[PDB]
Symmetry: D3
Subunit: 149 residues, 6 copies
């Protein structure tokens, strides 16, 4: 979990680990919504939905890990990793699996904050949707239901 | 190992990682006993026994990891994790698997030290016994022997 | 990856984690060569070769992780871990698997730097060769090709 | 400066230094006002005034230092120290002198944030006013003007 | 205070700061005694006495600062610094002045703990006595009384 | 010393302290020369000379402190501070006084290393010369001799 999150958060190039932080475990409601507030104050929105019906799912537990890296001995990178702690009941198990990666890159020539959301390419019962990496719209997360009999 | 120990040690709520420490690898003797001395000076006792005969087992290697967390931006939590490095010879392999979790919670209203021992719910050849979480008695650890032919 | 590297780097005895560092991802060329420059300035040479033909392999991605440990509350240990990020195309997958461990032990009685290269005993499609642990010669790394049909 | 601020910020009891942070140097305007935003979002207001006429003073440079302490091995204390970097022109010199100390004590039994503002008892040309230690009103800071001839 | 203690604690050679810790403020009783317990468990004894009469002095406030240094990129040095926070009433003021320095040097060839007590050569109203630097006997600290009229 | 060096090294803007390092105490020879090797490998040259005769001075003790700062929550600043530990014998005392400040600013748009040497504006018996802030030439340091009778 914490290191798999760290491996997805580590960027390309020389680097150093400065801080490991995490939020509280959040439980999705009937709207399937997960609102994570970054340190900069921006809200990144995710939605846990059924991979077939698209119905929003309650009972899914998430946790957001925050990593601070020194990059190239010149910058401080802030990389977030969203982890699904528990899949919703009746759905295929997703225990401590990273889903999304958020990179906060501040423009050096006096620019505003820029956020970029990537997906973790790991075969699991849950996966982030495919969309241009920006915080404009809500990013869906699909969960495979466990078929009985 | 170190992060699986960290994942079991991370509590519920906002948190930050402050320190990662570990003891020396200890090898159980014929009494099967493992005495771990916490930073507070208290001795937590564990016993490696056969899951069927109950005989105490020698040759099992353990290591105790100590994690310091900042919880809710107000407290410093000290969470220990016992890890079995190597199962005893002739027994099913248990390599770098967390077994127990110890939480040191000091009462804020001028209270003494309180210790709470939980078990790691991970299907493995070794597992901690079931008992009220207190350092009153010795907590057994059961190991499954590898049957030949 | 990062913690599996940390588990191989942790030595025997009381210890504490001080720093986690990593280099840039390096891609082996047609010579199969991987030159890693330690903090002391010494060059450790590795070569990615086919486990059968011995041909040097290009396209393999490596990353070197550096860990600083306080050992026994008296010394500062510097332990490197070489990790293969991606196996060369057409070869069996080796994703984020530690391969080698390098220990920098400086002689306390005013001695020069001494380097010791061990191998990670984990069954994988890639493995370090067998040789006395010293930085005298190039240490080969064997990769199993994926046979088609 | 930084350590004199640290000495005023260190509380009574066992303690450890976790983080040293500081804000930007702020320059008082014609209103003499200095608005410092703590990490919790609260605004502590100070006013640089003449010790005799009471006129608000511009040109005074301040810097706010933030210290994180582990107290008694159980809590994380956040102690702020206001430092006057440069006195206003024509006034007696106050170079890198601590003035006020702010302690953020969060009630452990699920209570809101409580802030307490103390003064540094060091004989200098500038000094904080005397008032109950709370963030209800603006705390004045008096500066002694340099009389000519 | 904290940095003047750090300057006396910094040894000769390349070094790095790892941890800053301090004990509680202790107040000398009628016996003038100050018992400081190092992390290793040893007790270093000091006695605050009048520089002329030799009478033990009560009301003196002390604080022990503990510094952890990485020395020469090979060792972890533990350097203590005793600081007199307040001189006893009726005696010349000694505010936040370092007095003694304690170095814990563990023998590398499997030797026991060795402690060495030096004095801070700073002209002040209080000063440590002169004695071979070992924890065998109680080290006196002399205080100059303020003569009236 | 260490904090006075830190105060001169702290730049303008939001900041955080990451590391405090120092070199070995160096003693100037008959050439008065002091060669400090930064972490980047560049050599900054200083020369201790008499403020009147200009004769190079031996016996002066220096120490170079290195500070790593996080600036504006985006960059990692490396600020060096040269401190004169002891003035040469027969010269006015200069004990633990900062002299020069070196800032290593790497150009963000893929530029080489740039070094800038400032002087500490503190009235003392020793002072750095006046020259454009670059590592092109040797920067002299003037020392006032103590006149007898």
């Amino acid at each position: 979990p914490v290191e798999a999150a760290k491996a997805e958060a580590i960027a390309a190039g020389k680097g150093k680990l400065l801080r490991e932080e995490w939020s509280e475990e959040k439980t999705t409601g009937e709207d399937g919504l997960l609102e994570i507030d970054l340190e900069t104050g921006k809200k990144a929105t995710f939605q846990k939905v059924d991979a077939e019906t698209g119905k929003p799912l309650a009972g899914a537990v998430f946790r957001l890990y925050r990593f601070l890296f020194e990059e190239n001995g010149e910058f401080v990178a802030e990389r977030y990793v969203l982890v699904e702690v528990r899949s919703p009941e009746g759905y295929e198990p997703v225990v401590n699996t990273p889903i999304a990666r958020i990179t906060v890159t501040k423009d050096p020539e006096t620019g505003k904050v820029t956020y970029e959301v990537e997906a973790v390419k790991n075969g699991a019962s849950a996966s982030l949707d495919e969309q241009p990496p920006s915080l404009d719209k809500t990013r869906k997360i699909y969960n495979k239901k466990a078929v009985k009999l």
